[PDB]
Design a protein around this ligand. Structure first.
Ligand code: CLA
Ligand code: CLA
Ligand code: CLA
Ligand code: CLA
Ligand code: CLA
Ligand code: CLA
Ligand code: CLA
Ligand SMILES: CCCCCCCCCCCCCCCC(=O)OC[C@H](COP(=O)(O)OC[C@@H](O)CO)OC(=O)CCCCCCCCCCCCCCC
Ligand SMILES: CC1=C(/C=C/C(C)=C/C=C/C(C)=C/C=C/C=C(C)/C=C/C=C(C)/C=C/C2=C(C)CCCC2(C)C)C(C)(C)CCC1
Ligand SMILES: CC1=C(/C=C/C(C)=C/C=C/C(C)=C/C=C/C=C(C)/C=C/C=C(C)/C=C/C2=C(C)CCCC2(C)C)C(C)(C)CCC1
Ligand SMILES: CC1=C(C/C=C(\C)CCC[C@H](C)CCC[C@H](C)CCCC(C)C)C(=O)c2ccccc2C1=O
Ligand code: SF4
Ligand code: SF4
Lengths: 130, 148, 739, 74, 80, 61, 160
């Protein structure tokens, strides 16, 4: 019926990925579920989970993350999202250090932090021709 | 009628100036966006947060004031053209009486003088004014596409 | 402790009247900004967010229905009271063809008494275009005392409905199981409401309207016509007009229904005296409708081992192409008020438009076909109501999808399968809309540019490249041949619009064959294109209300939200509400074109006067056929030409129409301030205004905030609709009353 | 007359737009300020609320009363 | 790709991180506030510009600021 | 300044700049913005409180 | 006279307007019967038209070439009843309204729930303040002197 046994029991929708997620990048979300719960696809309609390993492919990181946020309502937490380039170039994305970004984990450095409030930003006229 | 239309012109000038001056002075920031200078002259918005920030940039002030400039110039040109049409035709009493109320304008300037233009081509023939009727309809169409 | 109702659920107290926003969890804390005031009215009837129980929402809806029906009854009572006291109905009865119906007199203040027109019959007032006079005449009402008593009954009924709403919210509120008896509700609404209403109205027509109107058409003055109750107590006053009542009800119970052919006819056409439908035909129609609806009411299983279960019917309608089919639809329509509202509002608006068509097509009231203002107003009003109700049905379908749609309960059913291929539907509907618009409108523009270039033989006209609506003409031919061939018991076609003779009452045309040419082809395809685009906007709103490729979690943002942000290139108006906003705009466009087509076509090719020798002269003179094929033609020969009466109404009794014309223009232009601008500019301007107020120590404690983005859009669309519809209203009314 | 008046309106709107652009990207408060006190141009941003409020008052005054007289005549 | 900056007015309430639809923001250790945490933007290449992050910011004029910049198929939210 | 004190906000990028608020608590730790001030007027986001630095608040007499 | 206008009492076009309006009203009156309410209403219209024209004629009103009263609002007291006296009347009434509104705002602004008292008006206090606005010119030039009318620097300002 389906290419892989771990795919959710989805009947296919004309809202899945397109030619872009065959030559630029595609995103895969994996998770393990205790029950074959019925959930709503980020793209189309209702799909059925597998009582075990579940693997879904999407065209955007936002679609995978919306599916994962929906999974949290099913008490599912072990979901992990990967980015796949045109060949099998798998990169773990969402649980980047194994801890969700909302929980503080040691080993993270601040990126994009300014040691002042908004009012300390430089005047644009002094940022001309650089 | 000249008194009332001059006051309408003054209102148009003051409102266009209000929009433009508000956009110029509030360009560097306001209470809704105290760092607007960091986003440049033209940016879409600052998002739906803080109640909604549609048309918050200084470019949007120009964009809104263009409508008021067009309206004010339309009032000025309507006044000039109707006054001079009555002067040239000789019925200056038509302007002096009907220019004091809006229906006077709508009936005696637009509806009255639009008759030669719309009959630039009819199911019976056409005149050298046919191109002007086509341009009339073309302008209406472009106006409504702008409305889109 | 009844099994259907709960006794004394809510205490009747004024305490909550003094606490605005008590219904909402967020608004109950009190206002802090002016946004609270607007949120108070925007959430007043959103009972879904006020309670978490379907039972409470259902009870609130039931009482709100009672309040609405009380309001409607009060409105009807007011109409009847105005007919009784401030009308020339008695004078109009004696001269229907020469007296204009008026039922509202205007007080003499600030010079407004000029609005009291010369409606005739020694009366001054505003001419009435709602057709109440014709309806009352069709009801057999021949005196203003009867109108007064109907108004009193309407007041009593309105009080009764108010009391019913109070009773069923505060004293005995029905339970959820009572509301969910859709089988019982359908049985009752089909048999009792519809069928028994048709039966009661057939009885009234047969015993009151049939004799009184027959006497009126015979020339008997209303004063010497017997009182309506005398037609019941005396079987001889009605047996003279219809000599079949002498047999009593014996032919009915002996199945000899042929004896009642005197007053239960099947004639078709129109009454030559009044120009309306034969009231015998109307009574027979209502009788047949009553029998059909009573029969249809015995369909669903309610309390015995008899009837159908809607769940079993739906679940059995599967198919190879539709998966589970209608499984779960019964649960959807018995647990979601929004789905029921969507279906009911869509079908209700469609029914209103169908009513509008059948009204002028077959005038059902005496002396209403020759009252052109009444016909035009009735058609335009009913089409407008239909369009609004259809947009509302689409809106509530989207609301159901956002809020009450459960993905688990709708696995592989029709709703699921529709969402699964929404792309295909929307893309093909987009292609159809582009095809229809390109063709219809570009044929219009091609005609315009060929005429402007002096090439009259290159147009899409009748004397040029001709697009004959052959399919519609075939149907017209089939109907005019129906009496005697396919409807062998008919004496005349259903409507003279399909063909036949010119029907004139008092030298004024009532109905006449509506010829269809290349001009009607183009305007009909314009109608199809506009309807398709409106359907596209609304269906895109409904289908993409939960998720999309842009926002995969659009359902988590709710039905009503302005955007998701400036990202993704800009995510304005992605809601489903913002689709009911654009669809409202396009419905306005479509309905405006429809009513323009109706007005011009009727004035140019149906309405007019008939000379004694049989020569037909129309209001405009047949300019629709050759000048409605170009946009310049519509601008000049219709808008500019028929706007003459509106602009020249100053100083006359129609001056109010010119004033409303100007005011509606003003309101429509006012709308564009809200439609074109954005919230940030107005908030920053309010900042400086607040600075001035603070400088003068007069800044309000309730902080003034600019209208929210969604409210700005709502204000813009409401003002746009009001201005456009009011402009068309004043234009139509002044034009059709003057001529 | 129509051509020149439309060009005039365009030029005025452009002047104000470029003033706004100057405020956004070319204005330097340090140059227009000497020891806390502000020069003639920098002071336009101090009573900016007064300027905008009074422009709003004049616009509302003229609009209200011109429309009132016109509608009264209507 | 858009630019996201975090300012020391951060109170570490995590509402920005749990509102990001594309996993751009994360909470990192800090010593400038009671919570001992500050938001970070290490994955701005996935930033879409929806500005949900600063709609959930409780600080006075924001501690996370999104500056829209060059566009990308990821930042434009293109599934195609 | 202390709990219950009235201060004037000196932060320019503030919805309560030049306005007076009530100090809820002044943190004694090494945080950057210890002063917590509560206001009667909600800002554009709906909040009515904010943390301010020691040099961004001026006590009212 | 002023601006080339002439008094309406000597304006022929003014009397022509009156005669035409009366003639139209009488022609309308001809199509009704006896002392029926329509005829009474039209007769009242004629009487009111005549009274209005007579009052405008004897009102120091200047009429142009169209026979309509023109308003002389340059400031001269001769035509002071056209603009100046209505101007004073409106200034009094509007100052009353603004003063009572400001007083109510400042009075309920010092209570526990200022915002509640703005959607639910304290009708006793509102009535107390509203009838006290007859002294608004005096109250305004007694609060401005004491410095209680204008705020100084607690007013908020944007970033630039
Ligand atoms: C719900 C529909 C409806 C509508 C739109 C109207 C509208 C109107 N009615 Mg009316 N009326 C209605 C129902 C309605 N009525 C009912 C149900 C009754 C029976 C009690 C009446 C009994 C009635 C009488 C007896 C009179 C009117 C009058 C009027 C007119 C002046 C109203 C006015 O100034 O009151 C102002 C009201 C207030 C200031 C109260 C606040 C106005 C056109 C008057 C009229 O036309 O005068 C010639 C008049 O004399 N009505
Ligand atoms: C033959 C029985 C009968 C009849 C005539 C009606 C008639 C009506 N029902 Mg109803 N209903 C019935 C049985 C019936 N129902 C049953 C058995 C149920 C339970 C499943 C319901 C549940 C139900 C709901 C939940 C709702 C209705 C609504 C309506 C109204 C629709 C509005 C309309 O078309 O305006 C036509 C209006 C008129 C013709 C005016 C005259 C109608 C009067 C009020 C007679 C009503 C008959 C009433 C049932 C008799 C009970 C009297 C009481 C002392 C026991 C209409 C008055 C809707 C409504 O508007 O709510 C008020 C609504 O929301 N009904
Ligand atoms: C049977 C008809 C019906 C019913 C019961 C409802 C019921 C509902 N609708 Mg709905 N709707 C309808 C028809 C209906 N609608 C139609 C026909 C449309 C198409 C225009 C819509 C479009 C619509 C939208 C777009 C939305 C709703 C919403 C709602 C819900 C909240 C309504 C509310 O609080 O408004 C309270 C009432 C008001 C705010 C009144 C506003 C005043 C109106 C807009 C102006 C009327 C002007 C009037 C004609 C007079 C003008 C004359 C002028 C001279 C003064 C509620 C469940 C909202 C929701 O959240 O649903 C869950 C929502 O977002 N509806
Ligand atoms: C007069 C103004 C105007 C015009 C022309 C249109 C046109 C259109 N709108 Mg609309 N719209 C308008 C105002 C207008 N709108 C306003 C004011 C609003 C605000 C509410 C909207 C809101 C709106 C929505 C929400 C939607 C539309 C849609 C559509 C399209 C329907 C498909 C179609 O017919 O395409 C065919 C194009 C035309 C009929 C335009 C004229 C084309 C000519 C006649 C033929 C081709 C000419 C040729 C190519 C010229 C080549 C020469 C040139 C290169 C020099 C169409 C492009 C729908 C859409 O996306 O399309 C499916 C849709 O969903 N509109
Ligand atoms: C001599 C006068 C002058 C000069 C030198 C400039 C120069 C400049 N302006 Mg400026 N401007 C002017 C007048 C001028 N403007 C006027 C009069 C207005 C008011 C309308 C504006 C409004 C304005 C705004 C709002 C902005 C600028 C910007 C700019 C800068 C970039 C311009 C750019 O990207 O062009 C881009 C050019 C185009 C997009 C081409 C637009 C062509 C239009 C649509 C007309 C073409 C349609 C044509 C009529 C077809 C006919 C249709 C047919 C059917 C009849 C540049 C420094 C921008 C900036 O960032 O400044 C720093 C900016 O945001 N200006
Ligand atoms: C006919 C349409 C129309 C009308 C009446 C107005 C009216 C107004 N606009 Mg406006 N505007 C419009 C279309 C319109 N706009 C469009 C299409 C745009 C393009 C988006 C704008 C863009 C715009 C901007 C950007 C600004 C205005 C401003 C104003 C105000 C100017 C002050 C004034 O005249 O006060 C008198 C008000 C009126 C005469 C109209 C309302 C009075 C009604 C009739 C009272 C009825 C009570 C019952 C006023 C409320 C300015 C403003 O807010 O100034 C304070 C301002 O900054 N408008
Ligand atoms: C009643 C108190 C009050 C007072 C004293 C003022 C005073 C002022 N307003 Mg203002 N205003 C008020 C109410 C008030 N406003 C309300 C309710 C609104 C919302 C519509 C506005 C909207 C407003 C705008 C948009 C602007 C002003 C401006 C101004 C200033 C110039 C005068 C002017 O243009 O009038 C403006 C007056 C109106 C537009 C109409 C006000 C509506 C009614 C008449 C007032 C409400 C009466 C109130 C219900 C009485 C209740 C009191 C009672 C319970 C005791 C001046 C400081 C202008 C400014 O900043 O110039 C410096 C300006 O641009 N105001
Ligand atoms: C019209 C075509 C039609 O309605 O045939 C009917 C066709 C038959 O479907 P089913 O046999 O599965 O329907 C059985 C039950 O679902 C009853 O609704 O429905 C479709 O395949 C939908 C495709 C629409 C394609 C639009 C063209
Ligand atoms: C106009 C109007 C009104 C009024 C109304 C009315 C007046 C109504 C009436 C109604 C009626 C008055 C009804 C009645 C009905 C009746 C019926 C419906 C009956 C039925 C019967 C039956 C069905 C029977 C059957 C049978 C049986 C069962 C046994 C024997 C045999 C037979 C078959 C006979 C009001 C004021 C409200 C409001 C406004 C509008
Ligand atoms: C009466 C008379 C006279 C006198 C005259 C006069 C004295 C006039 C004046 C006039 C004037 C006096 C005018 C003015 C105007 C102005 C304007 C028109 C302006 C505009 C502005 C703007 C546009 C601005 C811009 C900007 C900004 C916004 C900021 C930044 C910078 C800039 C500058 C860029 C004489 C003795 C000779 C003789 C005759 C009589
Ligand atoms: C003017 C304007 C405002 C400001 C408008 C406000 C603050 C509305 C003020 C309404 C007043 C306070 C009450 C209404 C007063 C009217 C006289 C009452 C209506 C008239 C009756 C006859 C119904 C916005 O907030 C806005 C938001 C988004 C897009 C466009 C706009 C926009 O154009
Ligand atoms: S504010 Fe207007 S533009 Fe900015 S995001 Fe919300 S909707 Fe799109
Ligand atoms: S935009 Fe704001 S919310 Fe959307 S991703 Fe970038 S940061 Fe997170």
């Amino acid at each position: 019926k389906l290419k892989q046994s771990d795919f959710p029991k989805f009947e296919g929708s004309t809202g899945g990925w397109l030619s872009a997620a065959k030559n630029e990048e595609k995103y895969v979300i994996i998770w393990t579920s205790k029950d074959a719960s019925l959930f709503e696809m980020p793209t189309g309609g209702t799909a059925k989970m597998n009582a075990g390993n579940n693997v879904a492919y999407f065209a955007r990181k936002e679609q995978c993350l919306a599916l994962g946020s929906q999974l949290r309502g099913f008490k599912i937490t072990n979901y992990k999202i990967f980015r796949i380039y045109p060949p099998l170039d798998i990169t773990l994305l969402h649980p980047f250090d194994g801890v969700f970004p909302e929980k503080v984990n040691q080993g993270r450095s601040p990126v994009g932090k300014r040691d002042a409030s908004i009012g300390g930003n430089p005047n644009p006229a002094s940022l001309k021709f650089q | 009628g000249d008194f009332l239309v001059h006051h309408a012109i003054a209102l148009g000038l003051h409102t266009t100036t209000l929009i433009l001056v508000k956009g110029a002075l509030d360009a560097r920031g306001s209470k809704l966006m105290p760092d607007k200078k960091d986003f440049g002259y033209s940016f879409p918005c600052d998002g739906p947060g803080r109640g909604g920030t549609c048309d918050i940039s200084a470019w949007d002030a120009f964009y809104l004031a263009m409508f008021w400039m067009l309206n004010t110039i339309g009032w000025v040109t309507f006044y000039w053209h109707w006054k001079h049409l009555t002067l040239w035709q000789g019925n200056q009493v038509q302007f002096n009486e009907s220019s004091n109320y809006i229906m006077g304008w709508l009936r005696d300037y637009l509806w009255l003088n639009s008759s030669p233009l719309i009959n630039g081509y009819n199911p019976f023939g056409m005149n050298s004014l046919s191109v002007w009727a086509w341009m009339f309809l073309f302008g209406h169409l472009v106006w409504a596409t702008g409305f889109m | 402790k009844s099994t259907i109702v709960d006794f004394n659920p809510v205490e009747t107290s004024f305490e909550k009247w003094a606490k605005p926003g008590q219904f909402s969890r967020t608004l109950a804390k009190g206002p802090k900004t002016t946004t609270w005031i607007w949120n108070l009215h925007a959430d007043a009837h959103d009972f879904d967010i006020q309670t978490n129980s379907l039972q409470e929402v259902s009870r609130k809806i039931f009482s709100a229905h009672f309040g609405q029906l009380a309001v409607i009854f009060l409105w009807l009572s007011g109409m009847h009271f105005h007919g009784a006291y401030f009308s020339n109905y008695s004078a109009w009865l004696t001269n229907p063809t020469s007296t204009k119906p008026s039922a509202q007199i205007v007080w003499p203040i600030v010079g407004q008494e000029v609005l009291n027109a010369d409606v005739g019959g020694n009366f001054q007032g505003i001419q009435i275009t709602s057709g109440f006079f014709q309806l009352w005449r069709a009801e057999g009402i021949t005196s203003e005392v009867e109108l007064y008593w109907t108004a009193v009954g309407g007041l009593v009924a309105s009080f009764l409905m108010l009391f019913a709403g109070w009773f069923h919210y505060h004293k005995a509120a029905p339970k959820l199981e009572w509301f969910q008896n859709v089988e019982s509700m359908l049985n009752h609404h089909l048999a009792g409401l519809l069928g028994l209403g048709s039966l009661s109205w057939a009885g009234h027509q047969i015993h009151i309207a049939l004799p009184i109107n027959k006497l009126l058409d015979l020339g008997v003055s209303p004063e010497e016509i017997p009182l309506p109750y005398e037609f019941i107590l005396n079987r001889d006053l009605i047996a003279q007009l219809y000599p079949s009542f002498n047999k009593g009800l014996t032919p009915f119970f002996t199945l000899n229904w042929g004896e009642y052919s005197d007053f239960l006819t099947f004639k078709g056409g129109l009454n030559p005296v009044t120009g309306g439908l034969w009231l015998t035909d109307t009574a027979h129609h209502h009788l047949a409708i009553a029998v059909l609806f009573i029969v249809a009411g015995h369909m669903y299983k309610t309390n015995w081992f008899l009837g159908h279960s809607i769940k079993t019917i739906l679940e059995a309608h599967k198919g190879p192409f539709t998966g589970e089919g209608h499984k779960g639809l019964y649960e959807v329509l018995t647990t979601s008020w929004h789905a029921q509202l969507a279906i009911n509002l869509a079908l209700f608006g469609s029914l209103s438009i169908i009513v509008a068509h059948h009204m002028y097509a077959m005038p059902p009231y005496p002396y209403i076909a020759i009252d052109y203002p009444t016909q035009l107003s009735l058609f335009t009003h009913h089409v407008w109501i239909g369009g609004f109700c259809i947009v509302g049905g689409a809106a509530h379908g989207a609301i159901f999808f956002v809020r009450d749609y459960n993905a688990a309960n709708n696995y592989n059913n029709l709703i699921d399968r529709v969402i699964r291929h929404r792309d295909a539907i929307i893309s093909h509907l987009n292609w159809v809309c582009i095809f229809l618009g390109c063709h219809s409108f570009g044929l219009y523009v091609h005609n315009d540019t060929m005429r402007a270039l002096g090439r009259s033989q290159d147009l899409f006209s009748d004397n040029a490249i001709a697009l004959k609506p052959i399919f519609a003409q075939f149907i017209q031919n089939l109907h005019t041949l129906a009496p005697g061939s396919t409807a062998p018991n008919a004496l005349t076609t259903v409507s003279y619009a399909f063909g036949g003779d010119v029907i004139s009452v008092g030298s004024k045309i009532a109905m006449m064959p509506i010829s269809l040419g290349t001009a009607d082809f183009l305007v009909h395809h314009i109608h199809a294109f506009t309807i398709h685009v409106t359907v596209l906007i609304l269906l895109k709103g409904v289908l993409y209300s939960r998720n999309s490729r842009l926002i995969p979690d659009k359902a988590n943002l709710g039905f009503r939200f302005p955007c998701d942000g400036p990202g993704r290139g800009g995510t304005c108006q992605v809601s489903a509400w913002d689709h009911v906003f654009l669809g409202l705009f396009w419905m306005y466009n479509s309905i405006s074109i429809v009513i323009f087509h109706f007005s011009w076509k009727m004035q140019s090719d149906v309405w007019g006067t008939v000379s004694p020798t049989g020569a037909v002269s129309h209001i405009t003179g047949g300019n629709f056929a050759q000048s409605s094929i170009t946009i310049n033609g519509w601008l000049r020969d219709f808008l500019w030409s028929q706007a003459a009466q509106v602009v020249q109404s100053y100083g006359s009794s129609l001056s109010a129409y010119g004033l409303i014309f100007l005011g509606a223009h003003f309101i429509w232009a006012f709308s564009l301030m809200f439609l074109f601008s954005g919230r940030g500019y107005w908030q920053e301007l309010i900042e400086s205004i607040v600075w001035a107020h603070n400088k003068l120590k007069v800044a309000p404690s309730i902080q003034p905030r600019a209208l929210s983005i969604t409210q700005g859009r709502a204000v813009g669309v409401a003002h746009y609709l009001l201005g456009g519809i009011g402009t068309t209203w004043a234009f139509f009314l002044a034009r059709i009353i003057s001529v | 007359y129509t051509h020149h008046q439309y060009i005039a309106g365009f030029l005025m709107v452009g002047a104000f737009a470029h003033g706004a652009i100057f405020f956004v990207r070319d204005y330097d408060p340090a140059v227009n300020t000497r020891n806390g006190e502000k020069n003639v141009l920098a002071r336009m941003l101090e009573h900016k609320e007064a300027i905008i409020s009074h422009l709003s008052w004049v616009s509302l005054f003229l609009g209200f009363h011109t429309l009132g007289i016109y509608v009264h005549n209507d | 790709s858009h630019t996201v900056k975090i300012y020391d007015t951060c109170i570490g309430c995590t509402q920005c991180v749990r509102a990001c639809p594309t996993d751009v923001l994360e909470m990192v250790p800090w010593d400038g506030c009671k919570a001992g945490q500050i938001a970070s933007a290490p994955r701005t290449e996935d930033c879409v510009g929806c500005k949900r992050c600063e709609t959930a910011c409780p600080t006075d004029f924001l501690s996370v600021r999104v500056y829209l910049g060059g566009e990308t198929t990821r930042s434009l939210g293109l599934a195609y | 300044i202390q709990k219950g004190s009235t201060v004037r906000i000196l932060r320019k990028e503030s919805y309560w700049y030049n306005e007076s608020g009530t100090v809820v608590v002044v943190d004694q730790s090494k945080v950057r913005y210890p002063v917590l001030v509560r206001f009667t007027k909600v800002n554009y986001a709906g909040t009515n409180t904010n943390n301010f630095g020691l040099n961004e608040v001026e006590e009212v007499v | 006279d002023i601006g080339g206008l002439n008094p309406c009492k000597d304006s022929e076009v003014f009397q022509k307007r009156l005669a035409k309006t009366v003639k139209k009203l009488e022609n309308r009156l001809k199509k009704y019967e006896e002392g029926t309410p329509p005829q009474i209403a039209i007769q009242q219209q004629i009487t009111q038209t005549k009274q209005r024209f007579t009052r405008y004629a004897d009102s120091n009103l200047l009429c142009g070439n169209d026979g309509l009263p023109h308003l002389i609002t340059d400031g001269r007291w001769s035509h002071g009843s056209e603009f100046l006296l209505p101007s004073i009347l409106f200034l009094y009434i509007s100052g009353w309204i603004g003063w009572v509104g400001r007083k109510y705002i400042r009075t309920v602004g010092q209570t526990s729930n200022p915002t509640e008292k703005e959607i639910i008006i304290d009708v006793p206090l509102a009535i107390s303040i509203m009838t006290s606005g007859f002294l608004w010119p005096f109250a305004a030039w007694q609060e401005f002197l004491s410095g209680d009318l204008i705020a100084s620097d607690e007013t908020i300002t944007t970033s630039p």
